[PDB]
């Protein structure tokens, strides 16, 4: 029993799932990884979606575990193949494999997406009022000249 | 972004009409 | 002479050409104050798009072996070039490769461990820059004997140390905080 | 001329000279400052500005990390976040991302490298990933304590990593499978 | 567990040099604006003509 | 005057001198801007961020010993530079 959680693009629904049954209902990275890992380790596997849809964690009051870790510790599943962050608190209650994907905390910002629309560059540096003014000075010396 | 210049240029703008007043003063 | 129709033409033209030369001067100052060096190779994929600057890896190492084993089109192509490039772009020692980069006048690129790359970047005479992201993801680990009694505690120790931030800070200490090369290149034009 | 028209044309000459010189100078300013700015200075640099807000998830590992870290930058950021108004914390990851897209660049979202570059490669392609990672984590395959599957799945993960299967698979689901594509706009045309 | 993550990265010698172009100086004004000013020179001169 | 030979000369000469004076103005603006951009470092940390101006302390004194013993990152960097620098930046007397 391979436990995992629906998270894109790790484990996804093909949307045609109503027609299919079994491990053909799920598609994604972790599905293919589970397939290859099983192919190298030599066992038949069944993909099951965790009931609460939340990764591992532990409550101070109850003292119990929830999520895929819960399904592993309390023996509801045989292996957890999913994007599960390796922390100390988990390595005490479960055995982690070596990391198959390395990651970290990065910063996302709204892309620039800028192509300069401005139809007049020249009126940007000088204020509009300043141009109106310089027209008034032009006519203002023009009347004197006339 | 700045690039809005107003009052200073309005001053240097202002000295010119003064020069026009001087022009009328000399003309008469 | 006194024709005004020609006067307004010469005026709109003078205004126009004045605007153009002022814009030209402004942007020329903008280009003059800004020192921005054009990056010869921006991305790992970019190295494949040029047939002039050679690039190589270690002769016997994990880098070469990775490039061999990888089926990614870019990396496979790079491997095809390197195995087919004359003279050999592979070097015997790491220092040989670095020296080849330094004596190349910028005509040679070297593929190596991220750690070693940025470490050399922080050592004299600071002429080597590390560019682009890493092409794969591996890691260093602490070795213990099979079924040893020290295994679990040093594992949880590595984790705990990693989470407290000791490892990162320590790395910053020995790589950057002890750096001989200084902080960064001058983005502020001097003189 | 009669010397009055001369001084009119001269003071006018001074006037228009000052004005066009001002135009050139200020335009030079607006161009210089336009070329004087860089998108990503640093992860700390984002913390050193009090206008662009930044956030993480309300209940997650990121927040707990920022609180627990004693590094000055991260502590400063956390001190900021817990007192920041309005709250820079979001319920869902999609909530934060959606907040980034509606900010006009006035809000930053801190998230997993994977999720980051995935959203970067997913529609409507409005999110950019900047800077290096602020920490070092990893995903791993979980097995029951002292199970008969631990060592073999470990060795398996390793071998798959070395053959390049993991890299190809990741590349497929990030780049091949879904596409903003464009070949990174030819490296954004330099 | 790994205490340090790394990868294969690229090292290159900084150029530490500037190559003067003859057209690099006319570069700040775009080609299109120059063609435009040519067509403006002959296009105004043809009107004055 | 109206001769084409004189005309194209006036236009190309005008264009030429325009280019040169625009260049002079641009570079003068560059010089001024980077002269006003520069600030004297004035911070202790700033000396570590520069590889041109050398810095040293007394060879036998409280200053050197403090720089050695300090575990503060900035001072550690400065000390790392000073003890490994040639020629010696240390002096015997003040």
Best interface-test mutation with B: which of D2, D3, D7, D24 has the largest number of B CBs within 10 A?
A: D7
Question: Does C180 contact D at CB distance below 8 Å?
Answer: no
Q: Which residues of F touch C25 (CB under 8 A)?
A: 22, 25-26
Interface touch E1/A102, C-beta < 8 Å: no
In a domain, A93, yes or no: yes
* Distant-in-sequence contacts of C92-101, Cβ < 8 A, 24+ apart: C92/C59, C94/C58, C97/C56, C97/C57, C97/C58, C98/C128, C98/E11, C100/C56, C101/C128, C101/E11, C101/E12, C101/E13
Contacts of residue F10, defined as CB under 8 A and 6 or more positions apart, other chains included, come to none
Question: CA dist C89 to C25, C92, C132, Å?
Answer: 46, 10, 20
In a domain, A124, yes or no: no
**Gap between the Cα atoms of C101 and C125, Å rounded:** 13
Interface touch D109/A107, C-beta < 8 Å: yes
Sign of CA dihedral D142, D145, D151, D152: negative
Nearest-neighbour CA in chain C from D172: distance (Å):
10
Could you tell me how many helices (H) and strands (E) chain B has, helices first?
1, 0
- Say if strands D107-112 and D53-55 run parallel, antiparallel, or are unpaired: parallel
Could you tell me how many helices (H) and strands (E) chain C has, helices first?
7, 4
In a domain, A102, yes or no: yes
The single-letter DSSP state of residue E24 is: T
**Gap between the Cα atoms of C156 and C67, Å rounded:** 33
The residue with tokens 């609180």 is D67
Angle, CA C111 vertex, CA C106 and CA C116 arms, to 5°: 100
> What region, left, alpha or beta, does residue A134 occupy, with left being phi > 0 and alpha being psi -120 to 50 degrees?
alpha
Question: Does D132 contact E at CB distance below 8 Å?
Answer: no
- Say if strands C128-131 and E8-13 run parallel, antiparallel, or are unpaired: antiparallel
CB D122 within 8 A of CB D180: yes
Structure tokens at C170: 């320590």
CB D127 within 8 A of CB D97: yes
Could you tell me how many helices (H) and strands (E) chain E has, helices first?
1, 2
What Rg, from alpha-carbon coordinates, does chain A have?
Answer: 31
Angle, CA A92 vertex, CA A86 and CA A94 arms, to 5°: 70
**Gap between the Cα atoms of A79 and A102, Å rounded:** 20
User: Helix (H, G, I), strand (E, B), or coil: what is residue A51?
Assistant: coil
Task: Give the domain CATH number at A29.
Answer: 3.40.190.10
Sign of CA dihedral C40, C41, C45, C47: positive
First to last CA, chain E: 84
In a domain, A130, yes or no: no
Interface touch A88/C19, C-beta < 8 Å: no
Structure tokens at A73: 């510790």
In a domain, A121, yes or no: no
Question: Does D103 contact C at CB distance below 8 Å?
Answer: no
> How many CB atoms sit inside 10 A of residue D130's CB?
17
**Gap between the Cα atoms of B28 and C8, Å rounded:** 31
Task: Output the 3-class SS for C59-85.
Answer: CCCHHHHHHHHCCCHHHHHHHHHHHCC
Contacts of residue E11, defined as CB under 8 A and 6 or more positions apart, other chains included, come to C98, C101, C109, C110, C111, C112, C117, C120, C121, C128, C129, C130, C131
**Gap between the Cα atoms of A86 and A3, Å rounded:** 16
User: Helix (H, G, I), strand (E, B), or coil: what is residue B16?
Assistant: helix
Question: CA dist C32 to C20, D36, F31, Å?
Answer: 18, 11, 9
How many angstroms from the chain centroid is the CA of residue C37?
Answer: 13
Q: Which residues of A touch C163 (CB under 8 A)?
A: 87-88
In a domain, A70, yes or no: yes
Interface of C with E in 70-99 (CB under 8 A): 98
Nearest-neighbour CA in chain A from E6: distance (Å):
9
Contacts of residue D51, defined as CB under 8 A and 6 or more positions apart, other chains included, come to D106
In a domain, A27, yes or no: yes
- Say if strands E8-13 and A101-103 run parallel, antiparallel, or are unpaired: unpaired
Question: Does E5 contact A at CB distance below 8 Å?
Answer: yes
Q: Which residue range is the domain that position A8 belongs to? A: 1-109
CB E5 within 8 A of CB C113: no
Sign of CA dihedral E26, E28, E34, E37: negative
Query: Which H or E run includes B24?
Result: helix B7-27
Subunits in contact with chain A (3 or more CB pairs closer than 8 Å): B, C, D, E
**Gap between the Cα atoms of E44 and E38, Å rounded:** 10
**Gap between the Cα atoms of D55 and D100, Å rounded:** 10
**Gap between the Cα atoms of D121 and D133, Å rounded:** 18
In a domain, A126, yes or no: no
Q: How many CB pairs under 8 A join A and B?
A: 27
Q: Which residues of A touch C159 (CB under 8 A)?
A: 86-88, 91
Nearest-neighbour CA in chain C from A87: distance (Å):
7
> How many CB atoms sit inside 10 A of residue C101's CB?
25
CB C29 within 8 A of CB E28: no
Nearest-neighbour CA in chain B from A79: distance (Å):
56
> How many CB atoms sit inside 10 A of residue D87's CB?
12
**Gap between the Cα atoms of A56 and A107, Å rounded:** 25
Question: CA dist C18 to B12, C23, D27, Å?
Answer: 20, 8, 13
D52 phi, psi to nearest 5 deg: -75, 110
CB C114 within 8 A of CB C134: yes
How many angstroms from the chain centroid is the CA of residue C15?
Answer: 46
> What region, left, alpha or beta, does residue C184 occupy, with left being phi > 0 and alpha being psi -120 to 50 degrees?
beta
CB D135 within 8 A of CB D61: no
Interface touch C24/E10, C-beta < 8 Å: no
First to last CA, chain B: 48
Q: Which residues of D touch E5 (CB under 8 A)?
A: 136, 138
CB C98 within 8 A of CB C110: yes
Structure tokens at B11: 């001053």
Q: Is D83 annotated as a binding residue?
A: no
**Gap between the Cα atoms of D106 and C98, Å rounded:** 43
Documented resolution in Å: 3.2
Question: CA dist C138 to A57, C131, E4, Å?
Answer: 27, 18, 9
From C21, C180, C190, residue closest to F34, measured CB to CB: C190
Q: Which residues of C touch A122 (CB under 8 A)?
A: 19
Question: Does C3 contact D at CB distance below 8 Å?
Answer: no
Interface touch E5/C130, C-beta < 8 Å: no
Nearest-neighbour CA in chain E from D153: distance (Å):
15
CB E11 within 8 A of CB C56: no
Return the bridge partners of C55, or none: C109
From D8, D138, D173, residue closest to A99, measured CB to CB: D138
- CB burial of residue D55 (10 Å; 0-12, 13-18, 19+): buried
Question: Does F43 contact C at CB distance below 8 Å?
Answer: no
DSSP A64-124: -EESHHHHHHTTS-SEE-S--B--HHHHHHSEE---SEEE-EEEEEE--------S-STTT
**Gap between the Cα atoms of B17 and D48, Å rounded:** 48
The number of folded domains in chain A is 1
Name the experimental technique: X-ray
Question: CA dist C145 to A92, C151, E42, Å?
Answer: 20, 8, 86
The residue with tokens 């003890």 is F83
């Amino acid at each position: 029993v391979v436990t995992t959680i629906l998270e894109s693009p790790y484990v996804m629904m093909k949307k045609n799932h109503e027609m299919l049954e079994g491990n053909e209902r799920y598609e994604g990275y972790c599905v293919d990884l589970a397939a290859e890992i099983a192919k190298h380790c030599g066992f038949k596997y069944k993909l099951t979606i965790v009931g609460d849809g939340k990764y591992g964690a532990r409550d101070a009051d109850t003292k119990i575990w929830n999520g895929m870790v819960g399904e592993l510790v309390y023996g509801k599943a045989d292996i957890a193949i999913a994007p599960l962050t390796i922390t100390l608190v988990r390595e005490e209650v479960i055995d982690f494999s070596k990391p198959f994907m390395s990651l970290g905390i990065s910063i996302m910002i709204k892309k620039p997406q800028k192509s300069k629309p401005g139809v007049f560059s020249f009126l940007d540096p000088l204020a509009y009022e300043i141009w109106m003014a310089i027209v008034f000075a032009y006519i203002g010396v023009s009347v004197v000249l006339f | 972004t700045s690039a809005l210049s107003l009052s200073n240029v309005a001053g240097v703008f202002y000295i010119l009409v003064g020069g026009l007043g001087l022009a009328m003063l000399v003309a008469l | 002479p006194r024709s005004l129709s020609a006067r307004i033409v010469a005026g709109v033209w003078w205004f126009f050409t004045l605007i153009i030369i002022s814009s030209y001067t402004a942007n020329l100052a903008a280009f003059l104050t800004v020192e921005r060096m054009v990056s010869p190779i921006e991305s790992a994929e970019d190295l494949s798009k040029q047939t002039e600057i050679a690039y190589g890896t270690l002769d016997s190492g994990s880098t070469k072996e990775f490039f061999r084993r990888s089926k990614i089109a870019v990396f496979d192509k790079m491997w095809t070039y390197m195995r087919s490039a004359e003279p050999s772009v592979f070097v015997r020692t790491t220092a040989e490769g670095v020296a080849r980069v330094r004596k190349s006048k910028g005509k040679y690129a070297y593929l190596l461990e991220s750690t070693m790359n940025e470490y050399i970047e922080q050592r004299k005479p600071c002429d080597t820059m590390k560019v682009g992201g890493n092409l794969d993801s591996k890691g260093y680990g602490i070795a213990t004997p099979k079924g040893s009694s020290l295994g679990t505690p040093v594992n949880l120790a590595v984790l705990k140390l990693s989470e407290q931030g000791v490892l990162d800070k320590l790395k910053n200490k020995w790589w950057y905080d002890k750096g001989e090369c200084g902080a960064k290149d001058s983005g502020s034009k001097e003189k």
